[PDB]
């Protein structure tokens, strides 16, 4: 699945992937550097966690760099 990818904000292909994801969360520098970001592709939509905001979508390049 054609998806945008961190850290270069470029695009990929992922022949085994079926969904683009967008993971945002806080580390010790959230109030200084901002929120952490991870964009990519996966075979399935990754599992939710308590402190991470995850966004999944099943089209080509549906995870642009300006998250929210």
């Amino acid at each position: 699945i054609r998806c945008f990818i961190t850290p270069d904000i470029t695009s990929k292909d992922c022949p085994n992937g079926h969904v683009c994801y967008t993971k945002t969360w806080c580390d010790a520098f959230c109030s200084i550097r901002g929120k952490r970001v991870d964009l990519g592709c996966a075979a399935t939509c990754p599992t939710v966690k308590t402190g991470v905001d995850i966004q999944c979508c099943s089209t080509d390049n549906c995870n642009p760099f300006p998250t929210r």
Partner: protein
């Protein structure tokens, strides 16, 4: 309206100053750098204030110190 700076810390600082000079419309910054072999990415809003400009400059300098130049600054006028 995209701006990408890779490696040059002084030019990264010169851009962040010009962005926040006069811009009632905020901007979204993407800051990535490599440390200990792992690439780590942040998303930081930049306010038009001179205070938040100073803070962002310091974050660039701190990232440039850790990564040793292996940093990527992308600016989204969003």
């Amino acid at each position: 309206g995209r701006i990408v700076v890779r490696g040059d810390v002084a030019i990264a600082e010169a851009v962040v100053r010009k962005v926040g000079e006069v811009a009632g419309k905020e901007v979204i910054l993407l800051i990535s750098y490599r440390k200990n072999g792992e690439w780590i990415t942040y998303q930081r809003n930049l306010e038009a204030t001179p205070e938040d400009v100073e803070r962002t400059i310091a974050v660039i300098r701190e990232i440039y110190e850790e990564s040793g130049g292996d940093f990527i600054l992308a600016i989204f006028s969003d």
